[model samples]
Target: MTSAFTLNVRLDNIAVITIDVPGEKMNTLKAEFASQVRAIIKQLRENKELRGVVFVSAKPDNFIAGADINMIGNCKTAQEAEALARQGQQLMAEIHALPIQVIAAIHGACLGGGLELALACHGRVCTDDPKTVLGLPEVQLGLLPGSGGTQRLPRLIGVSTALEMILTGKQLRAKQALKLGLVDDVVPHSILLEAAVELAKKERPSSRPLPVRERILAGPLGRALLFKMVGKKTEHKTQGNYPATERILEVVETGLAQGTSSGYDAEARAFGELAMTPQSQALRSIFFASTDVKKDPGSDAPPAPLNSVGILGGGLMGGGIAYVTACKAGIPVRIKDINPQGINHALKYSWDQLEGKVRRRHLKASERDKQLALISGTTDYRGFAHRDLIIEAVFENLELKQQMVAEVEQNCAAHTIFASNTSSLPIGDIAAHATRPEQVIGLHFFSPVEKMPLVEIIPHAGTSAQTIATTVKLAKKQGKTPIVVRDKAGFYVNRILAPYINEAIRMLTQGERVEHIDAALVKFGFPVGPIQLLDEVGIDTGTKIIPVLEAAYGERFSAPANVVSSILNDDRKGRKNGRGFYLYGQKGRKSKKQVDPAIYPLIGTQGQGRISAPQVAERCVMLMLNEAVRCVDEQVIRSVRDGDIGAVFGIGFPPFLGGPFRYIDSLGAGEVVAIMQRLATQYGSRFTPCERLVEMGARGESFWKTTA
Candidate 1:
């Protein structure tokens, strides 16, 4: 029979153990592999000829990703999950108990139980590749590291560092892992196995000195205070929406406060319980959804080759687009702005980002210069001839976008696909006068383009299948999750977001305090309050968007007429003007936000009325959910799966709730419909549940399992 684990004996008495899981690209630890791993370990124990052992992977870029999340999801009972965790713990203990030295040679991602396995080894050496990241990211999937990670990590790196790494599930690069004493040595990829082999023959030394705070955390009195502090902060960040954070804190604290054996017991119990939680299920669903997205070929055929990109309008959006095109996609970008200053701004934007990476040692100076060289700016279409794709990140004006589309079609080859980065303007209108309308599409990137993960791809009716296929390819290349949506007034994201923001304004007109309204939603798990979001997005931007939505969807999208006029008359354009919902520092100066004292009188309100936090959150989220369901029904979005991914990635939708569609599913279809019905009765037809949702309630169906 063949084996996933293979042993190779070297003439120097050094044995190399190579792991390559059958029928898989990335290796993952499985309970079924226990006996196989045990057999290999037993052979190593009996082999007196072997002086040392080094574990390595046959996969070029992967050591081991972690345990199979599918197996974890399939666990039906706490006892079953606990047994799996214990099995892993006992197996790792056997390796730790081995008489001979064992070293881990890590490359690519070493994570969760994979890292725990490395922790059990006598020494560790890893390649210094950019993708060679190590972490225990079980917390992201709503589970703690159950196979002695909570015990061993703290003892190795101290409680403070381990808690930070485990709690956030942050992946660290090779240098970071080395600095934290997580790895004994970092070497080039070519020498990773050799370095591990050399290290296996020598005695491993003590790790680096712990930070002062970590030293304190290792003690009894300091341990109590550290746990107390992190406990409060974790609860504040999680808002009790994620139980895993609390459980992680509990298990780690137990290991420090109680004996290691007791801590291991607590870790296994918690893992079993967390495995069955709704939050874990929702989080795991995201993992599955993301995996499915990577596999989807945008079109039946392969995408056309994209080598160069031409960008117009060098504002914030344009600059960001250029940065990603050059930095992430490694595609040459040509910028053609109206003025040379705009061109300079875009160039500086790319230069600054690249230079920052150089300073962080993430990139060498030579590499930074090479990346910057890929981006060049011109005030005209001189460089557009060779551009395979041109994206216009201009202002949201129909005429301006139409003119740019016309210009790109005229300047470039007929095959050049024209993509617009307009947030709200309909893609159809932008292509209404285009001679080659089939090549026009909308690629809506959120503000701060380099950071935002989602990009809405709006394809007009005239847009060709090839155009979509190529654009999806390009968006993925730029490190974005692209959702293909039908051309509409607000497309998919803002279409759902418009009604939600409008409801918040209605509450403001009803005499709700600004801070209270914002506080309510924050408590409900949104990253920020709606009012604060308006300030950050620019209040004038919201005012413009509401009318566009109203023009298409009718009165529901309309703001309280007085609310819009008052804010405009007061010249309150939000953070840009430093005088919107929240006060800012002097113009061009940034400061902590305080509610603008002048806003109440300007809006003709005194904040005398009151509303419950739950009520505020309910009204806003229901409006958004109902609209999202309507989008699926109207075919504005491709599917509920896309809509869910779009909301969570595109907007600051709470992950614990798992976006609008998943949140509705968790609420039960009947319950969500009833709430919307109640809201519609009190707040008007704007709160009316869409047909899809009502049908779902009637049939007892879900977005995951049923259609409209």
Candidate 2:
């Protein structure tokens, strides 16, 4: 049988199946691969002399990124979607049940359907190369593992790890996957094929049939707990925006209860229905932005190389940036803080992540030590001279940032670029006192660095393009997607956020039940509602910034009647206080602990009521969306992509909406403008659509082009 995928009979009697799709950047499972795969399998079966078949990807840094996104895009209906999924499942099922032993030699990204394909093989070995990641992430694309992943994954690994990997749409490295039994072995990329081949020849070369953990999870009560835990996690994080995820979990549970065939049917059916949903479109847009962002210039000039770095303010944000920089990016960093404890905590944070890596065999003893040595925390600017660029994550105070900017200019090399991580204050103000203000740029990094992917680069009025180029380079070095913006009080993100948050609070005074207001927004597709966000971000955090919003936008920014009392007695400060909106740790339960119901009486004589969830959410969300358009109108953000990326990253804006701009477009600029008008008549002028949005509505223009 002739095959597109090469099946070379090596001298050692090992058959090497090299996957290289013609005319593509990466190998992806496509409709065209079906007949080719069958042919390859037929050839393998006919060669009775073949000892083992080892599968390897022809692409660099990627095994196969699952199904070709375009193929998934081809699904215009559920029936078409189901057939595609079914075809792939049948191919993999044949591969899995083959009499000849098969080994998957994965070196790079083995994700989604790609991981499923690998899972069907008798044995699996992945490269220990840092770039390698393995997982089943179909949920992120609004699909499930129709290709037998739902049935095989939990059976191969423990339910706990499999649940984490599948539900969250997260990926694991070669080592982590090996530890979880997601893969058979982890070896250097150099020897991956050889190792998999040798292992493939073993007497009983297969994963332990439904390992101990998976077998236990198959029990009735155990399955109930397993499903419940996954539901809670999906509920909180997904907040109902992604119905596909919860359905995937259900299908997985149902399949395990029945049999592999049962699970396979559920998986296929769910995948077909979900692949057509709007949530998938919105979520896939993020991947669209990310895939484009890597190749984007983000600035006019070529970026400078970023190997050494400096940071100010050893707080959580600062510490996280430094840790990811030193440990993840493999760059040496000099961190400055007022006290040694701040430095100690930062180091401890890095140590914790690296230690976890070591325990999982993801990292070597010496390599872990090397990464540890890369991070250094200090009270003074002792190592500033060697740094190429510096990023400041100091307090929001202008004077403190300006002071740090001046000190870095005085001590560091004159050519060293300076970056500020201020979320609200303009970057220009921080650079005013610096001798090298031309080099001072905003390097706005989101908190919990390892998780967040965005870095906003704000260039002030006087900031040089060199500063923008340098910091953008540094942001990339720190494992971030850099989006350049013009410096302002809130720049792009917070400017839009302020109006949205203010409107949510305003609803509280208008008599909407706090829980009702929150749940409505949550159900409508926000990860959480404004009332909940205010509590999470802290009422104090909101209060401190109220004056800033008021100063910028005036009467429209007036405090919602009793937000001050929320600060005084609510005694809630988001997740930190554990007493806000919904009490912390009550996750798997039905009702919340109530809003301390005591403070509600004190702050609201009228209490939350009257306003419909849609009305409250529209009033809040429109103001936010209006501000985003105003940013585009003002040229604060260069393009709609930057505006969308900044909002999704900086604030916890629900991702399915694609960001405020995309949401506005999806709502139809005309419809969004109409909603704003309705809110404006009842709420205030703050709800009015921005002039740009109004103009676009009149012209029937959109924020983004639907390009293939």
Candidate 3:
């Protein structure tokens, strides 16, 4: 096999090393490549006339996306993982010690080990293309940078800035990389290699000094304080769930205080330990599952061509759908609304989003205009005749959605798909009156659609495999993780989420304080508690699906009678109206939320409940877990992996727990059932384990066939 790394001495006595993994689209660092890289460096070092060395990729895009994760997954013990980290560190150290000037010419993604490799070079020149990004994102996988990144990044970019990037796993664009001193220059892709060669030929310069504030913060006392604060913040954010963040802080600080040698050892040791951690294993599983889902087309059939899309309605969902269709998918969109104001709202939505990017300099004015031009709005169906897809984001009423199907059929081509963005109404019911039911599917998107990553695609019994394939393609193009679900009420995400949220409400009705309910779940690892989420999603809008869910699933989904309705009737529409369970506005500090005192009396509670936080969390999460199992048993979701992905990406279930299925597997089905049975006796049948959970518990079976 040809080595991914090759050295060629240019006429200028500069060796250009190109990396292109055979049979792979992206260049990823591999353990086997360590010897190949050492060989290339050795040849360059032997050339007496060599003035410099440049590292570049032969691939059209992507330098090194990251290290081959499979290598880390293959480790059977902490010591084995530690040895791997040591090998990587040694390879980077060799590159850092190169006699001639060494430069990395980066054109696309340079992430994790890729960024660590660039950090070892004397200089870096990256393309200004939006595709060009750099980061040490190992922390996201429940591990720190196992290579020299933990040590080298801080020395190059200062402690605080590096900590922010490493801890958050944030990727920086070329311009941002240049600003952070991550790269020496940002040039066009055409000139990337030339610019790198020029930089390599120049005299090597000393590392730039940290900014005045950063320099001060890097001192003993300042660093002590900084680490203290950052540690506290990280603990609060992670709630002690992610060991990687703590290890990152310890490793970075150890390097700064004790020296690089100690830091390097600590990094390797931590990498080994973290790699074996259930948390990291779960996170890695999520990463692998998502990658697999992205590649899966949801059907064996090839997707039909998607040229243009038309959206019905100009509300928030419609506007968001239009924005992603035009901006992300690069597809022409025709938005039809009932009135001119709705059309204006949709157009303004796209313009405002583009303008924000322009203001941030992430996008040029011309590019913003070009993307915005793809979205045209009308009050009629004048431009819908040839549209390949027509998505209806109208009111959730079944009749209204069915009307959209009829109208799209009347105005568009026979093959034009009519996708409803209804969150609760069954896709089958919406397509019941359609002449071409096979072309109708549910394309449910979460609120604030542009920001959310998950989209549930529901295909009714009559929906063709071709429609499923085509819809999945469109969802992927829109930059969403699409999970194909059965045409069931509430689909997958909301089906599981509804019971969880209702349990929180039940606690509220029983006099559990609003803040207390939310705080328990937050501490338990949810991004927000149920009440807070209720407010954010809007009190009225959040409970709109309760009736549908209750009708289909029975009392398990039923919220305390009249509690939500009374809140809505009392004019609490949540954050949108600045009123709900929590007070909003200047009186309510954005960071420290204050529950509305009036809510206690309104709900006839004195904000006094004896239930512990853990108990509250257990009660709420059990229902969600139970519902998730039911989803798998019913095959509402395609697989356990899809169920896990949908829950994590859609409902903000703790990723460290690896979604509900993995969490259940970790807890053991029998143990989970035991807890549910205990809770059921104390809290009525709502906490009863579903039939699938009971069966699995009795059989000692797991949702995942094999543990990660």
Candidate 4:
């Protein structure tokens, strides 16, 4: 194959290096590209007439996604990974040591090794296009920026900002990048190369002054305190589950305290060590799986065109659905609520989100207004006739949802799909009375739809391939990771989640303190403990699905009825009512979440911490793991990959564990089954391992054939 890098001399004696990876949509850095890049650099160096150089991407929307992760996966040892990092560092160093001014003209995603390459350049000029984003996102893949990013970034933008960016893998837009001095100039896409060329023709770049806050924090005592605080905060957030965060902090500190050389060495060593870590492998698997899912259309048929969408109901779900459809998908949305108030709620939902973006300077008022204009609220179905798809986010009632199906079938086009965003009710039952049952499917969006990444596109038995393809297309357009799930009770996410929550409650009934159970699971790597999750999801709102789950799955899905009923009887509906397992809206309760002591008496239990935290985590998580396996065995989810993505994105199962399926693989099915058996003996039959797991355990098999 020909070189992906091409060097051309401009009439003014400036060399332009355009990067266009052969036969690929995005230009990702690869090991083979080292020689190609070196050849171009060597040519530019030999040309005495070359006054300057500009590096630009030939790709339309992406400069470079990152280093090819497959390269990292191919490394058999830490030494191999470290050698790879050293090679990248050496290439970037050569670019930095160039005699003439070198400017990077970035137009799209300049991420990971891409940003590291830009950092090596003497100057950077990026387009102000929304597509343009820059970041060192290696931390997301359980690795730090190994190719001198840990060193150069801190020098460019002070230590604190660099730490936040590298540690969290946050991508910055043009304005944000300019403010942080990460980029030299922000220009329109049409003039990106022109602006960069101008920069390259100028005298060599000088470092910008750090802001006053960063200046103060750059000193010895300030850095010590800053590192101490940030370290503690990061530990709390990561819960020590991710080793990359700690390594990032150490490498950045080593660079600042020792020297760039020391930092580079530390970075290379850390990269090698972290690459060998199971955590990084798991995270990389999630990345690959999500990428595969995005490419998968979910059906053989081509997706029907989704130009406009109609929404039913105007509550939180409806408003969120409308917001994503109009804003993210850029599709015209018609929202039909039963009353004017409901219509206003949906309109305000989109307005508030857009207003927030404007307030934060992330979006222009004109742009916000343009997106808002796409969403029209109505009390009737006047605009529903032409909508290509109608998503009903109404109450989770069989009769009500079925009526919506019938109404949409009557009011909309024949090809227009009827997608119900039901959490528990089976899609099959909702489509039972529909004239065109083939057109009805379930497009389940998690609560707070705009923020959540996962959406379950469930096709009932009668739903057509066209319906599935079209719904999956719409979901992806809304900036969601779409997973095709079978139409079953509670679907995939809630189905697996229900048993876990029930187990937490079971511990509560057995006199385990609420905070102890919550703290244990939090330490186990959940975003929130089950009890706290219940409060956030609303106690009453969360429990409504229990009956449906129990009815479908029998005794194993049952919850402690008395404890739930008594809590509900006392008007404790969780965060919405400022009452539940924890105190809410109470004075002096902001610093620490205080468990409601009254809940102990209300649930007929004393705060006797009988169960250990590990025990609590084990009981709850094992049930979740068992259910997740059952989901795979039952084909509720397409594959183990989909199951992992669904749990991590849909329910906030810890990403570091790489979702339940990978976690199961990490623990070996045999060990997991043994733990489940032990738990079952201690608790009840509900803790027993699922049949699929039992067979896998006996055979010493795993859900995934490979680690990554």
**Which candidate model has the greater TM-score, 1 or 4?**
4
For each candidate, what TM-score against the reference? 0.96, 0.86, 0.98, 0.98
- What C-alpha lDDT do the candidate models reach, one value each? 0.84, 0.77, 0.89, 0.89
Off by over 4 Å in 3: 587-591
Against the correct fold, how does model 4 do in TM-score? 0.98
lDDT by residue for model 1 over 1-708, one digit each (tens)? 567788877888788888888868888877788898888888887767777888898787789889998888778788999988988889989988877788899988899889999999888898888878899999889899989998889888778889999999999888888888899889998888878878877755455678676775565777888889998988888887899988988998887778867998999999999988888888887887777776775667667779888898886667899999889999999888888888888888988887888786686888888888888888866978768999998777788889998888788888998998887787888889999898898888887788788898888888988988999999989998888888878888888888788888888878898888888898888888888888787888756777778788788787776878888788888887788778876455445457877887777664576789899999998888888988998998887778888888876788777778889889889998899899899879988888788888998788887322
Clashes counted in candidate 3 amount to 0
Between which residue pairs do clashes occur in model 2?
A: 511-608, 511-609, 512-608, 512-609
Clashes of 4: 0
The alpha-carbon RMSD values of the candidates against the true structure, listed in the order shown, are 2.2, 4.1, 1.4, 1.5
**How would you encode candidate 4's per-residue C-alpha lDDT over 1-708 as one tens digit per residue?**
657888889899898898988867899888789999887888887868777899999789898888999999999999999999999999999999999998899999999999999999989999988899999999999999989999999888888999999999999999999999999889998888888888877775865888898988867999889989999999999999999999998998888899667889999999999999989988998999999999999999988879989999986668899999888889999889987888888888889988888886786788888778898888876988888999998888899999998889888888889988888888889989999999999988877677788999888999999889999989888999999999888888888888889988887877898888998999998889899998888888888899989888899989886888999999899888798789886677346888988988877565467677888898999989989998999998999989999998887888888889899988989999999898889789998989999899899688888644
In terms of lDDT, the poorest run of 10 residues in model 1 is: 585-594
Residue 658, model 4: lDDT of 89
Q: With candidate 1 superimposed using the best TM-score fit, by how many Å does residue 128's alpha carbon deviate from the native?
A: 1.1
Candidate 2 lDDT, 156-226, residue by residue in tens = 78766677777877889876777677888788877878797897677577536556766776668888997
Residue 426 in model 2: lDDT: 77
The ten-residue window of minimal lDDT in model 2 covers 599-608
